Amino acid sequence: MAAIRKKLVIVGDGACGKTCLLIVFSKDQFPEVYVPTVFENYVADIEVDGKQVELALWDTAGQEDYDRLRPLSYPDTDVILMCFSIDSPDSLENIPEKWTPEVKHFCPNVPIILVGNKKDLRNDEHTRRELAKMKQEPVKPEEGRDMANRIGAFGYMECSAKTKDGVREVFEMATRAALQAR
Amino acid sequence: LKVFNRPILFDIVSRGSTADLDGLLPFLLTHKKRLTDEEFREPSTGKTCLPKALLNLSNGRNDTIPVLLDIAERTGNMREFINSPFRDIYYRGQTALHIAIERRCKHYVELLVAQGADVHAQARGRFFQPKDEGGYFYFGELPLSLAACTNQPHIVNYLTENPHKKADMRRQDSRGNTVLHALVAIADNTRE
């Protein structure tokens, strides 16, 4: 019938590849030559179960001049992808204390889909060696379970834009979470 | 000339002086900048150059629109430039397509949609709200609803029937109101 429009906004720390994930879901090809800092004004056609949904993608950054404009993309949101880095432990202790309060205050009563990106990099030799140099280890799935438990996330899964795993499933889950109007 | 800042760009585009855009090609390409960056957009509302050009129309014709669109497509962010939503709470969601429709300019909306203008962008700002909810004009929060609510049958026919992209009349806005619901909403009891 008539496709329903749902607004998805992706929030994550710097250099997490959220924009890379957006491009790889959009054109089904990872851009290895040019990665725009933000992907904006895109609508994607998705189907979950007998429904057609146009998902409008919004990307928020904080590298420069984007932190002040981050609150401008919060109102009238429908679903949030709260993402972190699997190959970066410091990307998990920053999840609850600074992202969560502002996302809850600005846009309350919305489903939370916290995800971890670059799932293939947790087994990379270089990242493991660099982490073990300062006594750190890749983000374990137990860490993701704890993250989903303490923030009450709708669902958590690992995606890697390099090997194209579960991105369609991730966005299907996000749209499904957006389907229920609280 | 050799330096293109935001106030200068808006000063040129308000008057529709196309010749001053001749130097627009190198300056961007030399500096790897885009028309959609924060430098070239109004800080108050997030308005870009295209809505400013469409707002300031001389006798209904602004010759700088095709040149701006061509430079945007050569820049590589044509899609991101065509539909640049406003950011202020007072005009949130408005798109250059909405401004073209609200100006009763069929040629500009034709030339805009055919190259990638989203026909479902919901103008859900505080200005586009019912008069009983702190607003001035509620047209249905949709380009097709707006075209139907401003009594523009030709643009409605073009939007519904166009090879490029058609906006289905069964689509619902944020309120759930379809095109018929919006057309009822704008209606008065006057005969005309």
Coordinates of C-alpha atoms in Angstrom, one line a residue:
Chain A
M1 CA 0.0 0.0 0.0
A2 CA 1.3 3.4 1.1
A3 CA 4.8 3.3 2.7
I4 CA 5.0 4.8 6.2
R5 CA 7.8 7.2 7.0
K6 CA 10.0 6.6 10.1
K7 CA 12.8 8.8 11.3
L8 CA 16.0 7.2 12.4
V9 CA 18.9 9.2 14.0
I10 CA 22.3 7.6 14.6
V11 CA 24.3 8.8 17.6
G12 CA 27.8 7.7 18.3
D13 CA 31.3 8.9 19.2
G14 CA 33.9 10.2 16.7
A15 CA 35.6 7.9 14.2
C16 CA 33.1 5.1 14.9
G17 CA 32.2 4.7 11.2
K18 CA 28.5 5.5 11.7
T19 CA 28.5 7.4 8.4
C20 CA 30.3 4.5 6.8
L21 CA 27.5 2.2 8.0
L22 CA 25.0 4.6 6.5
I23 CA 26.7 4.6 3.1
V24 CA 27.2 0.8 3.1
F25 CA 23.5 0.3 3.8
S26 CA 22.6 2.9 1.2
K27 CA 24.6 2.0 -1.9
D28 CA 25.6 -1.6 -0.7
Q29 CA 29.3 -0.6 -1.2
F30 CA 31.8 0.6 1.3
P31 CA 33.4 3.9 0.3
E32 CA 37.2 3.4 0.8
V33 CA 38.3 6.7 -0.9
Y34 CA 35.9 9.3 0.5
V35 CA 33.9 9.2 3.7
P36 CA 31.7 12.2 4.3
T37 CA 31.6 13.2 8.0
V38 CA 27.8 13.1 8.0
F39 CA 25.2 11.4 5.8
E40 CA 22.0 13.5 5.6
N41 CA 18.7 13.8 3.7
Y42 CA 18.4 10.1 2.7
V43 CA 15.3 7.9 2.7
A44 CA 15.6 4.1 2.3
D45 CA 12.9 1.6 1.4
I46 CA 12.6 -1.3 3.8
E47 CA 10.2 -4.2 4.3
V48 CA 9.8 -6.1 7.6
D49 CA 6.5 -8.1 7.5
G50 CA 4.0 -7.0 4.8
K51 CA 4.8 -3.3 5.3
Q52 CA 6.8 -0.7 3.3
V53 CA 8.7 1.8 5.4
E54 CA 10.7 4.8 4.2
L55 CA 13.4 5.3 6.8
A56 CA 14.8 8.8 6.9
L57 CA 18.4 8.8 8.1
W58 CA 19.9 11.5 10.3
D59 CA 23.6 11.6 11.3
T60 CA 25.1 13.5 14.2
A61 CA 28.7 14.4 14.7
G62 CA 30.8 16.4 17.2
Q63 CA 34.2 16.9 15.5
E64 CA 33.6 20.6 15.0
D65 CA 30.5 22.9 14.7
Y66 CA 28.3 19.7 14.9
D67 CA 28.0 19.4 18.7
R68 CA 26.0 22.6 18.9
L69 CA 23.7 21.4 16.0
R70 CA 23.2 17.9 17.6
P71 CA 20.2 19.0 19.6
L72 CA 18.6 20.4 16.4
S73 CA 18.2 16.8 15.1
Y74 CA 16.6 15.3 18.2
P75 CA 13.0 16.6 18.2
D76 CA 10.3 14.7 16.3
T77 CA 12.6 11.6 16.1
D78 CA 11.1 8.1 15.8
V79 CA 14.0 5.7 16.5
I80 CA 17.7 6.1 17.6
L81 CA 20.7 4.0 16.8
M82 CA 23.0 4.5 19.8
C83 CA 26.3 3.0 18.6
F84 CA 29.8 2.4 19.9
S85 CA 33.0 0.8 18.8
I86 CA 33.8 -2.9 19.3
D87 CA 37.5 -2.4 18.6
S88 CA 37.7 0.5 21.1
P89 CA 37.1 -0.2 24.8
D90 CA 36.9 3.6 25.6
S91 CA 33.8 3.6 23.5
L92 CA 31.8 1.7 26.1
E93 CA 32.5 3.7 29.3
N94 CA 31.3 6.9 27.6
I95 CA 27.9 5.3 26.8
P96 CA 25.8 5.8 30.0
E97 CA 26.9 9.0 31.6
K98 CA 26.9 11.6 28.7
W99 CA 25.1 10.2 25.7
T100 CA 22.2 8.7 27.8
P101 CA 21.2 11.8 29.8
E102 CA 21.0 14.1 26.8
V103 CA 19.2 11.6 24.5
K104 CA 16.7 10.9 27.3
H105 CA 16.2 14.6 28.1
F106 CA 15.9 15.9 24.5
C107 CA 13.9 13.0 23.1
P108 CA 12.3 10.8 25.8
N109 CA 9.9 7.9 25.3
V110 CA 11.8 6.4 22.3
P111 CA 13.2 3.0 21.7
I112 CA 16.9 2.5 22.1
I113 CA 18.9 0.3 19.7
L114 CA 22.5 0.3 20.9
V115 CA 24.9 -1.4 18.5
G116 CA 28.6 -2.1 18.2
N117 CA 30.3 -1.4 14.9
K118 CA 33.3 -3.0 13.1
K119 CA 32.7 -6.5 14.5
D120 CA 35.6 -7.9 12.4
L121 CA 38.2 -5.6 14.1
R122 CA 37.9 -7.2 17.5
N123 CA 40.0 -10.2 16.2
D124 CA 42.4 -8.0 14.3
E125 CA 46.0 -8.5 15.4
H126 CA 47.0 -4.8 15.3
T127 CA 44.0 -3.7 17.4
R128 CA 44.6 -6.5 19.9
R129 CA 48.3 -5.7 20.2
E130 CA 47.6 -2.0 20.7
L131 CA 45.0 -2.7 23.3
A132 CA 47.2 -5.2 25.2
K133 CA 50.0 -2.7 25.2
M134 CA 48.0 -0.7 27.7
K135 CA 46.3 -3.7 29.3
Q136 CA 43.0 -3.6 27.5
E137 CA 41.0 -6.2 25.6
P138 CA 38.4 -6.1 22.8
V139 CA 34.8 -5.4 23.8
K140 CA 33.4 -8.8 24.7
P141 CA 29.8 -9.8 24.0
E142 CA 29.2 -9.8 27.7
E143 CA 29.9 -6.1 27.7
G144 CA 27.2 -5.6 25.1
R145 CA 24.8 -7.7 27.2
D146 CA 25.6 -5.5 30.2
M147 CA 25.1 -2.3 28.0
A148 CA 21.7 -3.6 26.8
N149 CA 20.8 -4.5 30.4
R150 CA 21.6 -1.3 32.2
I151 CA 20.1 1.1 29.6
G152 CA 17.1 -1.0 28.7
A153 CA 18.0 -1.1 25.0
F154 CA 15.5 -2.7 22.6
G155 CA 18.3 -4.9 21.1
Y156 CA 22.0 -5.1 20.5
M157 CA 24.0 -6.7 17.7
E158 CA 27.4 -6.5 16.1
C159 CA 27.8 -5.1 12.6
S160 CA 30.9 -4.6 10.4
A161 CA 30.5 -2.4 7.3
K162 CA 33.7 -4.0 5.9
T163 CA 32.2 -7.5 5.6
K164 CA 28.5 -6.5 5.2
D165 CA 27.1 -8.5 8.1
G166 CA 23.6 -8.0 9.6
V167 CA 23.2 -4.4 8.5
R168 CA 19.9 -5.2 6.8
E169 CA 18.9 -7.1 9.9
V170 CA 20.0 -4.3 12.1
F171 CA 17.9 -1.7 10.3
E172 CA 15.0 -4.2 10.2
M173 CA 15.1 -4.4 13.9
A174 CA 15.4 -0.6 14.2
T175 CA 12.3 -0.2 12.0
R176 CA 10.4 -2.9 14.0
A177 CA 11.2 -1.0 17.2
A178 CA 10.0 2.2 15.6
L179 CA 6.8 0.5 14.6
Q180 CA 5.2 0.5 18.1
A181 CA 4.1 4.0 19.0
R182 CA 5.0 3.7 22.7
Chain B
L1 CA 35.1 37.2 -6.9
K2 CA 38.0 35.0 -5.9
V3 CA 36.6 34.7 -2.3
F4 CA 33.0 33.5 -1.8
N5 CA 31.6 34.0 1.7
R6 CA 28.1 33.5 3.0
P7 CA 26.8 37.1 3.0
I8 CA 28.3 37.7 -0.4
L9 CA 26.7 34.5 -1.8
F10 CA 23.3 35.5 -0.4
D11 CA 23.8 39.1 -1.7
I12 CA 24.4 37.7 -5.2
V13 CA 21.6 35.1 -5.2
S14 CA 19.0 37.5 -3.8
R15 CA 19.4 39.7 -6.9
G16 CA 19.6 36.8 -9.3
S17 CA 22.9 38.0 -10.9
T18 CA 24.0 34.8 -12.7
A19 CA 27.2 36.2 -14.0
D20 CA 28.8 36.5 -10.5
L21 CA 28.4 32.7 -10.3
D22 CA 31.0 32.3 -13.1
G23 CA 33.7 32.2 -10.4
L24 CA 31.7 29.8 -8.2
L25 CA 33.1 26.8 -10.0
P26 CA 36.8 27.1 -9.1
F27 CA 36.5 28.5 -5.5
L28 CA 34.7 25.4 -4.3
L29 CA 36.7 22.9 -6.4
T30 CA 39.9 24.6 -5.3
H31 CA 38.9 24.4 -1.6
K32 CA 37.0 21.0 -1.5
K33 CA 34.0 22.7 0.1
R34 CA 30.3 22.0 -0.5
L35 CA 27.2 24.1 -0.7
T36 CA 25.6 22.2 2.1
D37 CA 28.4 23.1 4.7
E38 CA 27.7 25.2 7.7
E39 CA 29.8 28.0 6.1
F40 CA 27.3 28.7 3.3
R41 CA 24.0 28.2 5.2
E42 CA 22.1 30.6 7.4
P43 CA 22.9 30.0 11.1
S44 CA 19.5 31.0 12.4
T45 CA 17.4 28.5 10.5
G46 CA 19.8 26.3 8.5
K47 CA 18.5 27.7 5.3
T48 CA 20.7 27.1 2.3
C49 CA 21.2 29.1 -0.9
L50 CA 18.4 27.3 -2.9
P51 CA 15.5 28.4 -0.5
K52 CA 16.9 31.9 -0.5
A53 CA 16.9 32.0 -4.3
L54 CA 13.3 30.6 -4.4
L55 CA 12.1 33.1 -1.8
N56 CA 13.4 36.1 -3.8
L57 CA 11.7 35.7 -7.2
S58 CA 11.7 38.4 -9.9
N59 CA 8.4 38.3 -11.9
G60 CA 8.3 34.6 -11.0
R61 CA 11.6 33.8 -12.8
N62 CA 15.0 33.5 -11.1
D63 CA 17.7 32.6 -13.7
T64 CA 20.2 31.6 -11.1
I65 CA 18.3 28.4 -10.1
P66 CA 19.6 26.2 -13.0
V67 CA 23.1 27.5 -12.6
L68 CA 23.0 26.8 -8.8
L69 CA 21.6 23.4 -9.4
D70 CA 24.3 22.6 -12.0
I71 CA 27.1 23.8 -9.8
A72 CA 25.6 21.6 -7.0
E73 CA 25.5 18.5 -9.2
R74 CA 29.1 19.1 -10.4
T75 CA 30.1 19.5 -6.7
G76 CA 28.9 16.0 -5.9
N77 CA 26.1 16.7 -3.3
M78 CA 23.2 17.4 -5.6
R79 CA 20.9 15.1 -3.6
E80 CA 21.9 16.7 -0.3
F81 CA 21.4 20.2 -1.8
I82 CA 18.0 19.8 -3.4
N83 CA 16.2 19.0 -0.2
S84 CA 17.8 21.0 2.6
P85 CA 15.4 21.1 5.5
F86 CA 15.1 24.1 7.8
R87 CA 16.4 23.7 11.3
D88 CA 14.7 26.4 13.4
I89 CA 11.7 25.4 15.5
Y90 CA 9.6 28.1 13.7
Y91 CA 10.0 26.6 10.2
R92 CA 11.2 23.0 10.8
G93 CA 11.0 20.6 8.0
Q94 CA 10.3 23.1 5.2
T95 CA 12.0 22.1 1.9
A96 CA 12.8 24.0 -1.2
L97 CA 10.1 22.0 -2.9
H98 CA 7.6 23.4 -0.3
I99 CA 8.8 27.0 -1.1
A100 CA 8.4 26.3 -4.9
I101 CA 4.9 25.0 -4.4
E102 CA 3.9 27.8 -2.1
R103 CA 5.0 30.3 -4.8
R104 CA 2.7 28.8 -7.5
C105 CA 5.7 28.2 -9.8
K106 CA 5.0 25.0 -11.7
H107 CA 8.2 25.2 -13.8
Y108 CA 10.5 25.3 -10.8
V109 CA 8.8 22.4 -8.9
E110 CA 8.9 20.4 -12.2
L111 CA 12.7 21.1 -12.6
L112 CA 13.3 20.3 -9.0
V113 CA 11.5 17.0 -8.5
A114 CA 12.8 15.6 -11.8
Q115 CA 16.4 15.7 -10.5
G116 CA 15.9 14.2 -7.0
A117 CA 13.6 16.4 -4.8
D118 CA 11.8 14.4 -2.1
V119 CA 8.1 14.7 -2.5
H120 CA 7.3 13.4 1.1
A121 CA 9.3 15.9 3.2
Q122 CA 7.0 16.9 6.0
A123 CA 6.9 20.6 6.8
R124 CA 6.1 20.1 10.5
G125 CA 7.4 23.3 11.9
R126 CA 5.6 25.5 14.4
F127 CA 4.5 27.8 11.6
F128 CA 2.9 24.9 9.8
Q129 CA 0.4 24.1 12.6
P130 CA -3.3 24.6 13.0
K131 CA -4.4 28.1 14.1
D132 CA -5.7 26.6 17.4
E133 CA -2.2 25.2 18.2
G134 CA 0.0 28.2 17.8
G135 CA 0.4 28.4 14.0
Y136 CA -0.7 30.3 10.9
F137 CA -1.2 27.7 8.1
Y138 CA -1.8 24.0 8.3
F139 CA -1.8 22.5 4.8
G140 CA -1.3 18.8 5.8
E141 CA 2.5 18.7 6.3
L142 CA 3.2 17.4 2.8
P143 CA 4.1 18.8 -0.6
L144 CA 1.1 17.2 -2.3
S145 CA -1.2 18.3 0.5
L146 CA 0.2 21.8 0.2
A147 CA -0.3 21.9 -3.6
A148 CA -3.9 20.6 -3.1
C149 CA -4.5 23.2 -0.3
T150 CA -3.3 26.2 -2.3
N151 CA -5.7 25.4 -5.2
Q152 CA -3.0 24.4 -7.7
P153 CA -4.6 21.6 -9.7
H154 CA -1.9 21.5 -12.4
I155 CA 0.9 21.0 -9.9
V156 CA -1.2 18.3 -8.2
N157 CA -1.6 16.5 -11.5
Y158 CA 2.1 16.8 -12.2
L159 CA 3.1 15.5 -8.8
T160 CA 0.7 12.6 -9.0
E161 CA 1.6 11.8 -12.6
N162 CA 5.3 12.3 -13.4
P163 CA 7.9 9.7 -14.7
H164 CA 10.5 10.8 -12.2
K165 CA 8.9 10.4 -8.8
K166 CA 5.2 10.3 -7.8
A167 CA 3.8 11.1 -4.4
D168 CA 0.9 8.7 -3.6
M169 CA -2.2 10.5 -2.4
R170 CA -2.8 7.9 0.3
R171 CA 0.3 9.0 2.3
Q172 CA -0.4 10.3 5.7
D173 CA 1.5 13.1 7.6
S174 CA 2.7 13.1 11.2
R175 CA -0.9 13.8 12.4
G176 CA -2.1 10.9 10.1
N177 CA -4.2 13.4 8.0
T178 CA -4.2 12.4 4.3
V179 CA -4.6 14.9 1.4
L180 CA -8.4 14.8 1.8
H181 CA -8.1 15.4 5.6
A182 CA -5.9 18.4 4.9
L183 CA -8.3 19.7 2.3
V184 CA -11.1 19.5 4.8
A185 CA -8.9 21.2 7.4
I186 CA -8.2 24.3 5.3
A187 CA -11.9 24.6 4.2
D188 CA -14.1 27.5 5.4
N189 CA -17.8 27.9 5.2
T190 CA -17.5 30.7 2.6
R191 CA -18.9 29.9 -0.9
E192 CA -15.7 30.7 -2.8

